[PDB]
Amino acid sequence: ARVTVQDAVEKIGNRFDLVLVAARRARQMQVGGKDPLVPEENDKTTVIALREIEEGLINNQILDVRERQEQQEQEAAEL
């Protein structure tokens, strides 16, 4: 997680799409103030986002479902 990022690349595949998924999640915790899934243990957003991907909690499909699940709650509610 801090030294290694191979265990994180194992899960997604593309070294590039890993940084994009990890950044988007890092930004949700950095701005939205979302909760970390893994014990944070005094690590910055950088590391925590990798930990969730490394263990397998964060994915391209996972985050897109969860986005529109918060946004569809808003749709039904407004009108």
Between 54 and 73, how does the x/- string for binding to other proteins read (CB under 8 A)?
A: --------------------
> Residues 43, 55, 57, 62: which binds other proteins (CB under 8 A)?
43
Using rule CB under 8 A, residue 12 touches other proteins:
no
Torsion of Cα atoms, 4 then 5 then 8 then 12, to 10°: -150
| Locus of tokens 């991907």 | 53
User: What residues make contact with other proteins under the rule CB under 8 A?
Assistant: 2-6, 8-9, 13-20, 22-23, 26-27, 30-31, 42-47, 49-50
